[PDB]
Symmetry: D2
């Protein structure tokens, strides 16, 4: 088994394996970034609605107050 | 010739080692960044909640003041 | 939940990163072997061709010694 | 700034992943070359030695026919 034949043999193997690893890695990180993204928006919605309640109560406060005066 | 191989492997590990340390360091920092951003969002959520029930007890009291009043 | 998801992903990364670190640590070690064994056979073939080069070399040094002593 | 902190990290990753890919391709490409050089030089040393042995064998053949023709 020639070293030049052994060296080239490794080069085909590397080039192929390295090509497979990249593909898998890219898809993996895609999925993870996806999970986090979903969780982020989920957290975003919560903060969004929580703020709604607050400003909604604030509206009610100055709504009743707007009626306490004429009272 | 084996002096070429011995040279290569020692170069590989010296780099492979440096690569793992720099990578592990990199991920931990990114995880740190994200962790902080999340906590800040949690704090932000926890706060908007406290400021919601706060506003709620107020209207409960005001609507009571409006009722009893005439 | 971002915090809960971050922890999840963080664990998955540490999970695979260790596995992969081995599928490569072993692979790169099995390959440096093929080249290392090939280089040894190669270094041998030379040490064999060189010794042949000096094995036939001396043979000439004798046939000459016979041709002259007979002519 | 959730979606932002996530996007920043995704960009940093994609950026780092690129440089990691181009530094790897170089490193391996050169290390392979180096090994090819050594396997080539050695290879030549073999052919040079083989042609040398075969050269002498030619002599040993005809030089013997002279030991015969004479004797
Ligand atoms: Ca390419
Ligand atoms: Ca990540
Ligand atoms: Ca950094
Ligand atoms: Ca920072
Ligand atoms: Ca306040
Ligand atoms: Ca905005
Ligand atoms: Sm009052
Ligand atoms: Sm180790
Ligand atoms: Sm670097």
């Amino acid at each position: 088994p020639d070293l030049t034949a052994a060296l080239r043999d490794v080069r085909q193997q590397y080039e192929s394996v390295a090509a497979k690893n990249l593909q898998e890695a890219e898809e993996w990180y895609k999925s993870k970034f996806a999970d986090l993204s979903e969780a982020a928006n989920r957290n975003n919605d919560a903060l969004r609605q929580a703020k709604q309640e607050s400003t909604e109560y604030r509206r009610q406060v100055q709504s009743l107050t707007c009626e306490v005066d004429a009272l």
